[PDB]
Every structure is written in structure tokens, then in C-alpha cells.
Write a protein that binds this ligand. Sequence first.
Ligand SMILES: CO[C@H]1/C=C\C=C(/C)C(=O)NC2=CC(=O)C(NCCN(C)C)=C(C[C@@H](C)C[C@H](OC)[C@H](O)[C@@H](C)/C=C(\C)[C@@H]1OC(N)=O)C2=O
Length: 215
Amino acid sequence: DQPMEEEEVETFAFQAEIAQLMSLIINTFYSNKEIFLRELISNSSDALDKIRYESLTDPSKLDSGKELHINLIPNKQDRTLTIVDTGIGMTKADLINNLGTIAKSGTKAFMEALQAGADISMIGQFGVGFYSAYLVAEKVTVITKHNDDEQYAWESSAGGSFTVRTDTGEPMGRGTKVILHLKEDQTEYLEERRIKEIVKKHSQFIGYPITLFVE
Ligand SMILES: CO[C@H]1/C=C\C=C(/C)C(=O)NC2=CC(=O)C(NCCN(C)C)=C(C[C@@H](C)C[C@H](OC)[C@H](O)[C@@H](C)/C=C(\C)[C@@H]1OC(N)=O)C2=O
């Protein structure tokens, strides 16, 4: 009736500088942590620009979702804030290579900038804004579905490694879901008023609709 299923999980080590950056971010006392949302929203916009670009030539790539938008979903019960987009999504290699193992010139440049007095809010200018998620999350789970590929789950609690596996959770439409498992002292980002506030303050001019789902 219920034959056991089996799944192989792959664990990778973050490139040295990325691990260093995550450590700095996850432990920082920075007082303007709210910019994490702006960074994740900008990432979704980039993903949306990319699927839109592909649709310019191949309209069928939108069959998996014609609406290009961003959804924000807070969950107080399991203390998570999820940012979902119907962007291009990522392949398994996209996750393994571009979300952890391959060095990014911006990583060291950003840490050097901070040492030179830069502000953490500038992280996006160095192309490593995703990692700002750890300003408020103790763990980040990235669920992604690229056209013509399976759904994958990337996950890391910033202990120097991250995992990647074929997702067996709820199937999602094309796009990416960044699930922020918030730190116990950062639950304010689960509140409707707070979310509205930071979206209006840092992400009012986005090229795609953004919707907050409550209840
Ligand atoms: C975890 O989610 C993001 C993946 C990696 C992001 C990382 C490492 C990060 O910190 N910042 C980046 C933001 C980007 O927009 C971004 N896009 C290229 C350049 N324009 C912005 C100017 C990159 C480079 C690279 C990882 C893109 C992804 O590659 C599979 C993919 O091409 C794109 C589509 C994927 C993303 C931006 C993903 O976001 C969503 N929502 O899909 C960055 O590094």
C-alpha cells in the first residue's frame, strides 16, 4: 500500500569567501536588517525579466504560468516569510554552481568594501544580496521549478554547507520560492503592517506586481 520512497541528498560546501560572508551576515548586529526583502524582491524581478525575455522568442515557455509576479507569504505558525516569484526558476546546476560553490568576485569585493567602511545595505551592488537573507533567517530553504526540469529544494542553515535534492514537497508552478525560517528575534517580519512598511520603503518601483497574502 505504501512502498517506501528513496531520495538522495547532496551536500556541498560553500565557496570559502561565501562561507565567510554568511558568517559575517548571520552574526552581524546591523540595525537595518529590513533590506533583506528588497534584495530578495530584486532577485525575483531579475528572474521574472529572464523568463519574460525567453517568452519574447518562445511564447510556450509561459505555458507554466502566464502571470509574472511576486507573492509574499508570512506564516506565524512555523515562523517563515516566503517570497515567491513566477520567474525563470533554476536548474539543479544553477543551484549547485550559482547558489554556493562557484566563487563570485563580488563576495570578496563586498567584504573589502565593508572593511573600507561600506554599508551592508550595499550588498546588492556586489551581486551577493541573496545572502542578506541570513540577516533575519537562521535557515533558508529555496524551492525552485524551471521549465523542462524537475522541482528542486536547496537549503542551508549557514553552517558552511547547503543541501540540494529533488523536491518531494508540494509541487509549485514555474518560479522560485525563498522560504525564510526567521530567527526568534526577527519575527516582526511576519506582521502585515511591517511587511507593507518595508515594501513601500524599499521596493515601491518594481517592474512586476507584488502581492501580500494574509490569513
Ligand atoms: C536564490 O535566488 C537567486 C539565486 C542566486 C542569487 C545570488 C547568489 C545573489 O546573491 N544575487 C544575485 C542577484 C541577481 O539578480 C543575479 N542576476 C544577474 C545580474 N543582474 C542582476 C544584473 C545574480 C547572478 C546569478 C546567480 C543568476 C542566477 O543564475 C542561475 C539566475 O540566472 C537568476 C534568474 C536567479 C536568481 C536571481 C535567484 O532569484 C530568483 N528569485 O529566482 C545573483 O547572484
